């Protein structure tokens, strides 16, 4: 049961390396994510064959 | 003349960040057997490998006791390695300009742009205050002493 749908995009890590023999520890990356949602209806649709003459 | 300090020679090691940006200090002093004289390239101590100063605390105790004192402290980056005994060694005045810390024995903290601009290096350099002008009347036993703040692996 549900009305929407989300779906996850995670694109690439762009952050500059660190040169020579400096320490790293501490200048983490962050992964970054993006999300799109898809939203559920009903589409009906009716025909009437009617009249009896 | 090079007056050196325990740093200098290597008898107390510096500490050295592990972590990249964190902030590490440890106050760098001297103990002067005589009195200072201008000329005195005072090896306070030592930044290590890759690191910059981002703060400076400077106190000195009253290393002049006459009226109108002109001694003036030049703190900045020395030339050669570290504990080189060798008068060819020049400082700069890159952390602190003709500051007058000692004329009362006050504390004065980096006041110049250039302080927080020094580029890394890859070798240990060492950080020595020169007496820019000769006191009045030099003080026998006082001391000098920096507080380097500087973190390792700045970009």
């Known amino acids: 049961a549900g009305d929407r749908v989300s779906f996850d995009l995670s694109v690439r890590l762009r952050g500059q390396p660190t040169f020579g023999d400096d320490r790293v520890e501490g200048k983490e990356e962050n992964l970054k994510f993006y999300t799109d949602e898809v939203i559920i209806d009903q589409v009906r649709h009716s025909v009437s064959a009617g009249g009896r003459m | ?5 325990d740093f200098a020679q290597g008898i107390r090691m510096t500490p050295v960040p592990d972590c ?21 390239i005072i090896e306070l101590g030592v930044l290590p490998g890759n690191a910059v100063p981002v703060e400076a605390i400077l106190d000195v105790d009253d290393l002049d006791t006459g009226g109108a004192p002109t001694i003036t402290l030049d703190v900045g980056i020395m030339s050669g390695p570290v504990g080189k005994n060798d008068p060819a060694r020049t400082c700069g005045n890159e952390l602190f300009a ?9 504390v004065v ?47």
């Not at chain 2, 980096?110 to 302080?115: F, G, N």
């Open chain 2, 1 to 5: 003349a090079l007056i050196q300090s």
């Open chain 2, 20 to 40: 990249a940006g964190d902030v590490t200090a440890c106050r760098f002093d001297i103990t002067l057997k005589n009195a200072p004289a201008a000329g005195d």
């Open chain 2, 98 to 106: 003709a500051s007058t810390v000692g004329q009362a024995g006050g």
């Open chain 2, 109 to 155: 903290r980096a006041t110049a742009s250039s302080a927080f601009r020094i580029q890394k290096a890859e070798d240990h350099r060492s950080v020595g205050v020169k007496v820019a002008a000769g006191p009045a009347t030099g003080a026998a036993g006082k001391t000098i002493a920096l507080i380097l703040f500087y973190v390792q692996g700045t970009s």
